[PDB]
Amino acid sequence: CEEPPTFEAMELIGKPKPYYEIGERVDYKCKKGYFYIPPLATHTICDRNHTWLPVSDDACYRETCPYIRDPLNGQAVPANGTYEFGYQMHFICNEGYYLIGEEILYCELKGSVAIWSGKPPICEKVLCTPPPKIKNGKHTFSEVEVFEYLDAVTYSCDPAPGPDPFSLIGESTIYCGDNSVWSRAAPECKVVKCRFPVVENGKQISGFGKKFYYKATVMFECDKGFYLDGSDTIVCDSNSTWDPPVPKCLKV
Amino acid sequence: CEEPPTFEAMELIGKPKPYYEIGERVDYKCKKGYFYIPPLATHTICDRNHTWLPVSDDACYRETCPYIRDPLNGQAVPANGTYEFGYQMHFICNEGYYLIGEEILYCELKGSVAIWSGKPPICEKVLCTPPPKIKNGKHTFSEVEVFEYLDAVTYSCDPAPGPDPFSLIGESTIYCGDNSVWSRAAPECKVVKCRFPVVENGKQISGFGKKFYYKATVMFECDKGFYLDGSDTIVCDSNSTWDPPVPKCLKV
Amino acid sequence: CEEPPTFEAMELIGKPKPYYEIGERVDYKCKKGYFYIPPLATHTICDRNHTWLPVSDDACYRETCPYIRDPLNGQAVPANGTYEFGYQMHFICNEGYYLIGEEILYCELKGSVAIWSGKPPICEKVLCTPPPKIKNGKHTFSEVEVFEYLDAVTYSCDPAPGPDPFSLIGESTIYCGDNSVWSRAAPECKVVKCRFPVVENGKQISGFGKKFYYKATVMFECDKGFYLDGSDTIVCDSNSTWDPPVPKCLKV
Amino acid sequence: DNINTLWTGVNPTEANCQIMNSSESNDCKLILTLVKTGALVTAFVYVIGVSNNFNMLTTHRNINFTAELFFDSTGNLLTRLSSLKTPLNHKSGQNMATGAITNAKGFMPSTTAYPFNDNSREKENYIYGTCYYTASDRTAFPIDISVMLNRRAINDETSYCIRITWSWNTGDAPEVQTSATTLVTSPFTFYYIREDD
Amino acid sequence: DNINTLWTGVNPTEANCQIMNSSESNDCKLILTLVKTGALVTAFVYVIGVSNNFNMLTTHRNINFTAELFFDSTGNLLTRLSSLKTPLNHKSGQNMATGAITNAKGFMPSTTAYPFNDNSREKENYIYGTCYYTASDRTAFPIDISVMLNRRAINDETSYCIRITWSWNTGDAPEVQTSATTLVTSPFTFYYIREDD
Amino acid sequence: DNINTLWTGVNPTEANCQIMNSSESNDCKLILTLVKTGALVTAFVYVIGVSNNFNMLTTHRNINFTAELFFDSTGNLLTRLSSLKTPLNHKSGQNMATGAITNAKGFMPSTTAYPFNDNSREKENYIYGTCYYTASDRTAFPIDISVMLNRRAINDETSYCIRITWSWNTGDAPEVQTSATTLVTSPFTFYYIREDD
Ligand SMILES: *[C@@H]1O[C@H](CO)[C@@H](O[C@@H]2O[C@H](CO)[C@@H](O)[C@H](O)[C@H]2NC(C)=O)[C@H](O)[C@H]1NC(C)=O
Ligand SMILES: *[C@@H]1O[C@H](CO)[C@@H](O[C@@H]2O[C@H](CO)[C@@H](O)[C@H](O)[C@H]2NC(C)=O)[C@H](O)[C@H]1NC(C)=O
Ligand SMILES: *[C@@H]1O[C@H](CO)[C@@H](O[C@@H]2O[C@H](CO)[C@@H](O)[C@H](O)[C@H]2NC(C)=O)[C@H](O)[C@H]1NC(C)=O
Ligand SMILES: *[C@@H]1O[C@H](CO)[C@@H](O[C@@H]2O[C@H](CO)[C@@H](O)[C@H](O)[C@H]2NC(C)=O)[C@H](O)[C@H]1NC(C)=O
Ligand SMILES: *[C@@H]1O[C@H](CO)[C@@H](O[C@@H]2O[C@H](CO)[C@@H](O)[C@H](O)[C@H]2NC(C)=O)[C@H](O)[C@H]1NC(C)=O
Ligand SMILES: *[C@@H]1O[C@H](CO)[C@@H](O[C@@H]2O[C@H](CO)[C@@H](O)[C@H](O)[C@H]2NC(C)=O)[C@H](O)[C@H]1NC(C)=O
C-alpha cells in the first residue's frame, strides 16, 4: 500500500514500511505542541484497492501559551503572530521608560503544558544625574539632584572678563533623553575674538565694527578690474579663525 | 410564643418568627469568640402555657488569646483587662530602652483559633551620637564615639582671649535622654561684658567693680528727695544688656 | 556460667548476671557506629560443661562517612586514617590559597546514617592590598590596586637632596605572602652619613674616601709598639654610627 | 464496597457550600471525600469557586477562609450549622447515594485521640498541610492549610467537628482583576484516627 | 485481595521505561503502584535510573523529565504511546500477575472530575507535590512534581491520561561527574477520584 | 476488618516508648498505625511527650531524635531492641487486641524493594517528609522527618527495620523554659511496599 501519508500536525507511530498488505492499520499521534480534539479519526486502514482510507490532521489543534497582559508604560508584541508553540514575545517600553527583566520570552512546553520562559519585564521611569559642569558658564536648576524625562536645562556664560565677553558655542538647552543620557553635549563658554578682516584692492560692504566675536558675518566687494578669489561672505568660527579664510582681490 | 429570648454569649440559628406554635423548638449557637462546654442545653421548646422553657448562655465560654510574656526591659499591658476576643495588648519599654516592632497587638480569630496580630516587640538599649560641637568651648569625653543612657558630659569655655573671659550661658552638664536625644540644648561660650551702670541722683550699694560680666548683680539707692523708677536690682543678660534696664531717680 | 564475654564491636543486651544456669541464652547487638552482616551468630547459649558456646563480633562491620573529594587548590587529610565513626577530616589549602568554611569536619551519626558535620570548605585565591608608602622613596607597580600571590615590588630611593644621597636600609624587593600579608617590612630611605674615622697611633688600610655612607667598610692598622683595642674592621650602621665603635691603638 | 466512602459527589451542578461570612447564599463547591482505611480515614478535600466575590479572593495579598463541618451524636452532618449545605452520603458512581448511611459515626474523628476543650492535649487536635493554586500564567501558588479536629463545639448538638482553613500571606497577589477567573485549590489529603462504628 | 492493586512490580531486572526523548531504548525503571481506596486511587510513583545519560542528569542545574502514561477505553496501558513499555497488572507477591485485569477502568482518573480540553475547568486537572534525592553526601535534594490528570489527548485511542513531571532549578547541581551514581527519586503519593468499573 | 491494622492504640495511659539514649525509663508515647492498603502500607506516626527532659527539647535550637523499630522473621516487634517497649497488635475499638496477630510479616517493609546492606540500592531505602509542632503562641513549627526502611540490621534477630528521625536546626528555639509544656508532633503519613504474608 506504499508509504503512509505525511501530515504537518500529526506524526506516524513506528517506522514506515515500503509496502503494506490489505487490511494493515497505521496510527498517528499529534506532534509536540499539538493536542487531539474528538471525534475525527487519527488512523487509516488499507482498502481492497491497495490504497489508504481518507484521514486528516484536522483533529490536532495547536498548543498555546498564556495571554501576556501589556506591561505598565510598555507593550508586549508577538513577533511571530500568535501564542502558539515555538513562538516568541518581544517587549518595548514607552517614551521615557527603561526595561528591567527579560526583553524576550519564548513559548516553551514543560510536561505537555505550554509555559513562557519567565516572568514579564517591568518598565521603570527614566531618571538621569545632573548635567556636566562647564568652565566660565552656569546652567538652570543648579541645585536639583535628580532629573526626570524631558527636563530641560538652559546654559548661560558668566559676565565679560574685560573688554571682550564669553561666547557660547553649541546648543544652550539640553534635556534628559530616553537612554538616561543628556540629549546633546554641554556647550562651551570661551572668549572668541577674530582678527580685523582687511582685503587688498577690496572694500567691506556688511558687518561694520571694530571688534568681531563668535558667528560674526562680514561681506567683501572687489574694486574695478579685480576678481574675487574665494567666498565674499566670511564667518568667525569657535577657534577665533575666519571660516572660509579671508578673500583676496586679484588683478585681471 | 412571641420572639425567642436574646443572649450576650449565644445567637439564634435562623430568622425569628413573630409567633410560634406549642411544641416548636428553637436552637442557639455560641457567638464568634465563644465556645460550648457541656452539659447545659442551648435550645428551648415552647410549653403548653405559650411560654419558652428556661434556657441560659452559661454553657458558652469566652475564647482567649495566648499569654504574652513581658518583653525583656519592657512590659505587656492588657488595655481592656483580659486576653478575651476583640481585646488589644499594649507594649511600653523601660527607662533607657526603645521599641522595635509592633507597639499594639490585637486578639484575632483565624479558623476558630484565637491568635495575636503578630510577634511581640523587642526593647533595644538607647544609644546616642556625640554632643554638638560649640564655638570657643569644649566638653568632657571628647574622644568617645557612642554614648549610652544617662551618660553625662560637662561643657567648659576656652581660656580668656584678652582682658575679658568667655561666659557660659545655659546648663553645663547634658545627658543622653530616653528618645535617643540629648536632654538639653548645648550651652554658649560668648564674651559677655555689660556697660558701667550709672544712675543720676542715685548711689550704688552692691556689686562693686570696674568690669561686669554675665549674671552680674548690681543694686541702687536714690538720694534724699528722689523716688526710684523701676527695679533697684539689675542683672546683666547674655546679650550684654542690663535686664531690667538701668533705673532712674526722679525728683519729688 | 559466669559473666558473658566482652567484645569491641558488639554489646550485651540487658544487665549481666554473676552466675547463669545450663541452657540460658544471652544476646549481643552491634555498638553505635557498627552494622550487622549475615550469617554469623550474635548470641551464645551455656553448654552442659558450664561454659559459653563459641561466638565472635566478626559479623559487626564499622559504619563509614561519605568520601570527601579533595577541594579545588587544597586537600582533605583523614587525621585518624579512615572514614570510620568517631573520626575527623582536616583541610589544608595549597600555596597561595586561603580557607573559607570549616577547617575540621567530624564523622557523626544521625538516625543510624553516617553523616559529616557540614559542607566541605573552599580554597580562595590569595589577594593583598598595595604595599606601604615610604617617605623619600618609591616602589614599582605604583598604580596597581590589587596584588595576587608571589607578585614582587622593588623599592628605590628618590634622587640626592644635595651632596649626600638617600640610603636604602633593608630588602628592596617584597612579595605577597600566603597569609595575605607582605613577606617583609617596607625599607627606609634615610640620609646616612658617618663621621670621619681617625685612630690615634694607627693608620687606615682600606675604604679610602672623604665621605662615608650606609654599609661603608673601613680597616685599621696600629703603629710600631701599639696593640689594637677592639676590631680592625668597622661598618657604618643605619643610625649614622660606626658598628663596632672606632678602635684605639694603646701603647705596650 | 460503596459503604466505605462518605462524599459530596463529583462536581455538583450548583454550589453546595457557603464558605464565607459576607455571602448571603452558597458561594462555592466543596469536594469532600472520606474513605475508611482501617483505623484511619483518608480525608480528600478541595474547593471550586462559584460566586464572583469568592473568585476575586485571588486579587488580594492576605486571605484566609474556613470550611466548618459539624456533626451530631450519630455522625450525621448538621447543614444549618456547617459551611456545607448538602448532607454527605455513600458512593453512587460519580454522585451521592439516596438511602441510609451505614455507620456514619465510623467516619467521624475520634474523641479519644482528638478531645474537646482539653488544654493539656490541645496540640493533638491540629493538622497542617499545603495545597496549590494554578494561576493564569500556569504557575503553582502555595496555600497553607490549618485543620482542627473536634476541639471546639458550638452547641449541644455538635458531637464531631472538622475545620479546614485555607490561607496565604504574600507580597504579590496570585491574580489581578483581568487575569482572575475561578478560585480552585489542589486536592489536599490528611489522615486522622476514626471513632468506633 | 490482589485485584485492588495495579502495579509495575518490584525492581524489574531490566528497564521498563523510556522517560526521555534523547534515548533510543529503555532508560529507567518506573515503579508505579495504583491501589483502589474507596472512590479514590492511592498512586505511588518513583524512578530508578538505568542508562548512563539519565543518571548524569544529577550533574545539571536545570532539569525536567516527564513520564507519560496513556490508556484506552477499557483502561489498558498503550505501551507504544506511553513512557512505560511493559503493561500494568495485579499483585503476584513482589511481581506482576499473568492473567486478566479485573476492572481496569476502575483505576483510571475520572473524566467527570478531570475533564478533557475544558479550559473553564483546567485548574482541576493539576496536582503538585515534592519528592527527594539522596545525594552522595547523604543529604536530601528536593524535586518538584507536576501531575496532570487527563486534560490532553494525543489520538483517538487515548481515553485516560496520567502525566508525572519531576523537575528542579537550583544554583548548585545535586551531584558531580565523580560523585554521581544512580538517579533515584523518593516515593511520591498522590490522590485522585477514580472512574467507574 | 480489624486485622488490616497493626497499631499501638490511642493515647496509652503510661509512656510506651524510650526514644532517647539519656533516659533510664520510658520517656514518651509513640502513636504508630500500620494499615494494609493493597500492595502498600499506610504508616501513620507521631509522638506525645511524657518525661520533663523530652518535653524540654522545645527550648533548644539544634535537636534530633530517632524512634528505632526492630522486627523478627515472623514480623513481630523486638521490644528489648526497639524504642517502643509495648508490642503492636490489631484494632480493638480505640485500643490494641489481646489475641494472635494475623499475617504480621504482611505489615513489614519489603526486602525486595528496601534491601539490607546493598550500597548500589542505598537511595531506595530512604523516605523524607515534614510534620509540625503547635507552639505556645499557636503557630506551626516545621520539623524534618528522615525515614530509613530496613537497610541496617543490629543482630541475627532483626529481619525487618523501620527508623523514624524527627529533626530541626533553626536560629530560634520553638519554645522557652516558661512557655514549653508538652512536645507533640503532628501526624506524619508515609508509604512503602509491603512484604508478602
Ligand atoms: C475500488 O474502486 C472502485 C472503482 O472506483 C469502487 O467502485 C466505485 O464505487 C463508487 C462509490 O460507491 C461508485 O459510485 C461506483 O459506481 C463504483 N464503480 C465501480 C466500477 O465499481 C469500489 O468501491 C472500491 N472498492 C473498495 C473495496 O474500496
Ligand atoms: C519567529 O520570529 C523570530 C523573530 O523574528 C525569528 O527569529 C529570528 O530569525 C532570523 C532568521 O533565522 C534571525 O536572523 C534572527 O536573529 C532571529 N531573531 C530572534 C530574536 O530570535 C524566528 O525564526 C521565528 N520562528 C518561527 C517558528 O516562526
Ligand atoms: C402552666 O402553668 C401552671 C400555673 O403556674 C403550672 O402549674 C403550677 O405548677 C407548679 C410547679 O409544679 C405547682 O407548684 C403549682 O401547684 C401549679 N399550679 C396550678 C394552678 O396548676 C403548670 O405546671 C404549667 N403547665 C405546663 C404544661 O407548663
Ligand atoms: C479596648 O480598649 C481600647 C484602648 O483603650 C479601645 O480603643 C480606643 O477606643 C477609643 C473610643 O472609641 C478611641 O478614642 C481610641 O482611639 C481607641 N484606641 C485604640 C488604641 O484602639 C477599644 O474600643 C476597647 N474595646 C473593647 C471591645 O473593649
Ligand atoms: C564437655 O567436655 C568434654 C571434654 O572435652 C567434651 O568431650 C570431648 O569432645 C571432643 C569433641 O567432640 C572429642 O574429641 C573428645 O573425645 C571428647 N572427650 C571426652 C572425654 O568426652 C564434650 O563434648 C563436652 N560436652 C558438651 C555437652 O558440651
Ligand atoms: C583522632 O585524631 C584527632 C586529631 O589528631 C585526636 O584529637 C586530638 O587529641 C589530642 C589528645 O587528646 C589533643 O591534644 C588534640 O587537641 C586533639 N585534636 C583535635 C583536632 O581534635 C582524636 O583524639 C582521635 N580520635 C580517635 C577516636 O582516634
SS (HEC) of chain C: CCCCCCCCCEEECCCCCCCCCCCCEEEEEECCCEEECCCCCCEEEECCCCCECCCCCCCEEECECCCCCCCCCEEEEECCCCCECCCEEEEEECCCEEEECCCEEEEEECCCCEEECCCCCEEEECEECCCCCCCCEEECCCCCCCEECCCEEEEEECCCCCCCCCEEECCCEEEECCCCCECCCCCEEECCCECCCCCCCEEEEECCCCCECCCCEEEEEECCCEEEECCCEEEECCCCCEECCCCEEEEC
Q: In the 8-state DSSP scheme, what is residue A171?
A: -
**How far is the CA of D120 from the CAs of B31, C18, D151, F17, in angstroms?**
24, 46, 12, 20
CA dihedral E77, E104, E161, D43 (to 10 degrees): -140
Q: How far apart are CA E178 and CA E136, in angstroms?
A: 10
A34 and A89 share a domain? Answer: no
Q: Does D118 touch chain F (CB under 8 A)?
A: no
Quote the domain boundaries for residue B97. 63-126
Instruction: Characterize the bridge pairing of strands C137-139 and C152-157.
Output: antiparallel
Residue where a domain terminates, one of C162, C192, C222 = C192
Contact E138 C114 (CB under 8 A): yes
3-state secondary structure of E53: helix
C115 vs E138, E176, E179: nearest CB: E138
Q: Which residues line ligand 6 (CB under 6 A)?
A: C 79-80, 86, 88
Q: Does E169 touch chain D (CB under 8 A)?
A: no
First to last CA, chain A: 101
| Phi, psi angle pair for F142, to nearest 5° | -75, 135
Q: C41 is written with which cell numbers?
A: 551468630
Cβ count within 10 A of residue A154: 12
Strand partners, F132: F142
Q: Is A53 in the pocket of ligand 1 (CB under 6 A)?
A: no
For residue D174, say if its preceding peptide bond is cis, omega within 30 degrees of 0.
no
Q: Which residues of E143-158 are buried (b: 16+ CB within 10 A; e: fewer)?
A: bebbbbbbbbbbbbbb
Q: What is the side-by-side order of every strand in the sheet holding F188-193?
A: F5-7, F28-37, F40-49, F188-193
Q: Of C18, E53, C20, C40, give the one whose Cα is nearest residue C28.
A: C40
- Other chains touching D, judged by 3 or more CB pairs under 8 Å: A, B, E, F
Query: What are the chain D neighbours of B38 within 8 Å (beta carbons)?
Result: 153, 156
Determine the residue of chain E that is closest to A43 in CA distance: E156
Q: How far apart are CA A128 and CA A146, in angstroms?
A: 6
B185 and B206 share a domain? Answer: no
Q: How far apart are CA B202 and CA E44, in angstroms?
A: 115
**Which is the closest atom of ligand 5 to the Cα of C51?**
28
Query: What are the chain B neighbours of F179 within 8 Å (beta carbons)?
Result: 69
Cβ count within 10 A of residue A131: 21
Strand (E) positions, chain F? 5-7, 28-37, 40-49, 62-71, 91-92, 95-96, 126-134, 140-149, 160-169, 188-193
Residue where a domain terminates, one of B20, B44, B62 = B62
B214 and B230 share a domain? Answer: yes
Q: How far is the CA of B46 from the centre of ligand 3 (A)?
A: 15
Q: How far apart are CA C56 and CA C67, in angstroms?
A: 29
Query: What are the chain C neighbours of F66 within 8 Å (beta carbons)?
Result: 111-112
Resolution reached, in Å?
A: 2.8
Q: In the 8-state DSSP scheme, what is residue F53?
A: H
C111 vs F81, F146, F156: nearest CB: F146
B176 and B203 share a domain? Answer: no
C111 vs F155, F157, F163: nearest CB: F163
| Phi, psi angle pair for A57, to nearest 5° | -90, 20
Instruction: Characterize the bridge pairing of strands C10-12 and B147-148.
Output: unpaired
Instruction: Characterize the bridge pairing of strands E160-169 and E140-149.
Output: antiparallel
Contact E55, E49 (CB under 8 A): yes
3-state secondary structure of F4: helix
Q: Report angle CA C176, C177, C179 to the nearest 5 degrees.
A: 125
Q: D2 is written with which cell numbers?
A: 460503596
Query: What are the chain E neighbours of D140 within 8 Å (beta carbons)?
Result: 126, 128, 146
Encoded amino acid at C173, one letter: T
Breaks (C-N over 2.5 A) in chain D follow: none
B201 and B237 share a domain? Answer: yes
Query: What are the chain F neighbours of D123 within 8 Å (beta carbons)?
Result: 133-134, 182, 184
**How far is the CA of C155 from the CAs of B64, C137, C183, in angstroms?**
78, 7, 14
Q: Report angle CA D186, D189, D190 to the nearest 5 degrees.
A: 140
3-state secondary structure of D106: helix
Closest Cα of chain E to A134: distance in Å? 48
Instruction: Characterize the bridge pairing of strands C217-222 and C127-128.
Output: unpaired
D110 vs F48, F94, F132: nearest CB: F94
Tell me which H or E stretch contains D53. Answer: helix D52-55
C204 and C175 share a domain? Answer: no
Contact D8, D16 (CB under 8 A): yes
Q: A75 is written with which cell numbers?
A: 507593550
For residue E109, say if its preceding peptide bond is cis, omega within 30 degrees of 0.
no
For residue E12, say if its preceding peptide bond is cis, omega within 30 degrees of 0.
no
| Phi, psi angle pair for E165, to nearest 5° | -110, 115
Tell me which H or E stretch contains B134. Answer: none
C169 and C203 share a domain? Answer: no
Contact C50, F175 (CB under 8 A): no
3-state secondary structure of E122: helix
Q: Residue A133 — left, alpha, or beta (φ > 0 → left; ψ -120 to 50 → alpha)?
A: beta
B103 and B133 share a domain? Answer: no
For chain D, list residues whose CB is within 8 angstroms of any CB belonging to chain B: 64, 66, 68, 80-81, 117, 146, 148, 151-158, 163, 165, 167
Encoded amino acid at B189, one letter: C
Q: How far apart are CA F54 and CA F62, in angstroms?
A: 14
Q: Of D31, D12, D26, give the one whose Cα is nearest residue D131.
A: D31
Strand partners, D141: D133
CA dihedral D121, D127, D128, D134 (to 10 degrees): -160
B55 and B3 share a domain? Answer: yes
Q: Which residues of C201-225 are buried (b: 16+ CB within 10 A; e: fewer)?
A: ebeeeebeeeebbbebebebebeee
Q: How far is the CA of C50 from the centre of ligand 5 (A)?
A: 13
Q: How far apart are CA A130 and CA C216, in angstroms?
A: 62
Q: A139 is written with which cell numbers?
A: 546652567
Residue that is written with C-alpha cell 468499573 in the block: E197
Closest Cα of chain B to F13: distance in Å? 24
Q: How far apart are CA C202 and CA D4, in angstroms?
A: 125
Q: E144 is written with which cell numbers?
A: 518538584
Q: How far is the CA of A79 from the centre of ligand 2 (A)?
A: 8
Q: Does D8 touch chain E (CB under 8 A)?
A: no
E91 vs F39, F123, F127: nearest CB: F39
A27 and A83 share a domain? Answer: no
* Structural domains of chain E sorted by starting position, each given as residue range(s) with its CATH number in brackets: 1-197 (2.60.90.10)
Contact D30, D129 (CB under 8 A): no
Cβ count within 10 A of residue A80: 12
Encoded amino acid at F61, one letter: R
Name which of F144, F154, F160, F164 to mutate to probe chain C: the one with the most chain C Cβ atoms within 10 A of its Cβ. Answer: F154
Q: F192 is written with which cell numbers?
A: 512503602
Residue where a domain terminates, one of B78, B110, B126 = B126
Determine the residue of chain D that is closest to A115 in CA distance: D138
Query: What are the chain F neighbours of D42 within 8 Å (beta carbons)?
Result: 42
CATH of the domain at A242: 2.10.70.10
Q: A87 is written with which cell numbers?
A: 513562538
Q: Does E4 touch chain F (CB under 8 A)?
A: yes
Q: Of F21, F6, F147, F159, give the one whose Cα is nearest residue F83.
A: F21
The structural domain count of chain B equals 4
Q: Report angle CA C79, C81, C87 to the nearest 5 degrees.
A: 65
Contact F122, F115 (CB under 8 A): no
Q: Is C49 in the pocket of ligand 5 (CB under 6 A)?
A: yes
Contact D196 F35 (CB under 8 A): no
Q: In the 8-state DSSP scheme, what is residue E178?
A: T
Mutation pick for ligand 1 pocket among A45, A48, A52, A53 (CB with most ligand atoms within 8 Å)? A48
User: Is the sign of the CA dihedral A226, A228, A229, A235 positive or negative?
Assistant: positive
CA E25, distance to chain mean position in Å, is 18
Q: Of E125, E105, E132, give the one whose Cα is nearest residue E195.
A: E105
Q: F141 is written with which cell numbers?
A: 513549627
B224's CB contacts (< 8 A; 6+ apart) are none
Nearest ligand atom owner, CA of C79: 6
Q: How far is the CA of C49 from the centre of ligand 5 (A)?
A: 9
B69 vs F138, F139, F179: nearest CB: F179
Q: Of E148, E140, D40, give the one whose Cα is nearest residue F91.
A: D40
| Phi, psi angle pair for A63, to nearest 5° | -80, 130
Encoded amino acid at A1, one letter: C
Contact A113 D138 (CB under 8 A): yes
Q: Does C112 touch chain E (CB under 8 A)?
A: no
Tell me which H or E stretch contains A243. Answer: strand A242-243
B55 and B112 share a domain? Answer: no
For residue C39, say if its preceding peptide bond is cis, omega within 30 degrees of 0.
yes
Q: Which residues of D162-186 are buried (b: 16+ CB within 10 A; e: fewer)?
A: bbbbbebeeeebbbeeebbebbbbb
Q: How far apart are CA E40 and CA D34, in angstroms?
A: 10
Contact E163 A41 (CB under 8 A): no
For residue A39, say if its preceding peptide bond is cis, omega within 30 degrees of 0.
yes
Q: How far apart are CA A92 and CA A103, in angstroms?
A: 8
Q: How far apart are CA E182 and CA E58, in angstroms?
A: 9
Mutation pick for ligand 3 pocket among B49, B50, B52, B53 (CB with most ligand atoms within 8 Å)? B49
Closest Cα of chain E to C8: distance in Å? 27
Q: How far apart are CA A181 and CA B247, in angstroms?
A: 72
CA E43, distance to chain mean position in Å, is 9
Contact B112 D68 (CB under 8 A): yes
Tell me which H or E stretch contains E54. Answer: helix E52-55
B244 and B227 share a domain? Answer: yes
Determine the residue of chain A that is closest to E19 in CA distance: A111
Q: Is C47 in the pocket of ligand 5 (CB under 6 A)?
A: yes
Q: A126 is written with which cell numbers?
A: 527614566
Q: Which long-range contacts (CB under 8 A, 24 or more apart) does A77-84 make?
A: A83/A107, A83/A114, A84/A33
H helices of chain F, in order, are 52-55
Strand partners, C245: none
